[PDB]
């Protein structure tokens, strides 16, 4: 994508989203990041949507194959491994964009928290498939990224800010599903929900709708976990 203008890559990412062509969308947004300029809020959202859809399809396929393998010639394991390697490659690509150089240039809380949440998310997806001598280190990398994002969010954003809420939601999923810490997951979701509820009175109608949508996801997890 080096020969395409930044603005044209952004426009094509938006068209690829409308066309449900998420691999194309991710390639356009990687090209846009590699121009070297910081991303606006809307551009960060395009980057995250693109890779979430790509890695989401890979994770769903890995889970199907892993289930068949666990019920079970070499073919199911070989194909699960192929999908696993592809998934790992996408997560490494995202992590490499964050490390070269999105996080280090992000100075505002909204951008820095967003990118650190992404870093925690993509290490968490690596942790979902990890088994070898690096599973522990991958889990700690997710935890460290989420914890730095939490520390900034609590100091710099109100408790209803949607990024702060989505960070807390995903960190609680990390505790429940990856770190074997269901009580930490439940405590974080409950405290996050309660502190957001007490700040809703400060919001406009549209901000209220954005925050309460994410609060409902926290409630949905608490219903499954309690």
């Amino acid at each position: 994508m080096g020969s395409m203008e930044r603005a044209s890559l952004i426009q094509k990412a938006k068209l690829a989203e409308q066309a449900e062509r998420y691999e194309d969308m991710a390639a356009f947004m990687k090209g846009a990041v590699e121009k070297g300029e910081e991303l606006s809020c809307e551009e960060r959202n395009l980057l995250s949507v693109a890779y979430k859809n790509v890695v989401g399809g890979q994770r769903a396929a890995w889970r199907v194959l892993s289930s068949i393998e666990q019920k079970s010639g070499p073919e199911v394991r070989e194909y699960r491994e192929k999908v696993e390697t592809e998934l790992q490659g996408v997560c490494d690509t995202v992590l490499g964009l964050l490390d070269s150089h999105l996080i280090k240039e992000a100075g505002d809380a909204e951008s820095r928290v967003f990118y650190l949440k992404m870093k925690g998310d993509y290490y968490r997806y690596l942790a979902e498939v990890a088994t070898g001598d690096d599973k522990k280190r991958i889990i700690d990398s997710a935890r460290s990224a989420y914890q730095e994002a939490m520390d900034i969010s609590k100091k710099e954003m109100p408790p209803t800010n949607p990024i702060r809420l989505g960070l807390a939601l995903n960190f609680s999923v990390f505790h429940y599903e990856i770190a074997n810490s269901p009580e930490e997951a439940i405590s974080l979701a409950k405290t996050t929900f309660d502190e957001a509820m007490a700040d809703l009175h400060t919001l406009s109608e549209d901000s209220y709708k954005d925050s309460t949508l994410i609060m409902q996801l926290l409630r949905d997890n608490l219903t499954l976990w309690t």
């Binding site: 959202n45 949507v49 979430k52 995903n170 996801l217 949905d220």
Partner: peptide, 9 residues
């Protein structure tokens, strides 16, 4: 359970 769906801009 559910992380942020995050699949639509």
């Amino acid at each position: 359970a559910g992380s942020i769906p995050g699949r639509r801009s």
